[PDB]
Amino acid sequence: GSSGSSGNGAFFCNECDCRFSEEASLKRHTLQTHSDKSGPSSG
Numbered sequence: 172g173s174s175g176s177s178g179n180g181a182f183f184c185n186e187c188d189c190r191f192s193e194e195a196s197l198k199r200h201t202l203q204t205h206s207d208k209s210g211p212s213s214g
């Protein structure tokens with residue numbers, strides 16, 4: 172798919188499977204859901 176598409180919604184989490192209408196909405200999820208320090212972070 173190339174630039175130009177009816178209706179926004181082209182942001183899907185890379186780590187997990189999800190969708191977000193806005194970019195800001197996704198970014199947050201990525202952090203909250205997948206905190207920068209979660210994997211090696213025992214807790």
Ligand SMILES: [Zn+2]
Nearest residue numbers: 184186187204
């Ligand atoms: Zn995610």
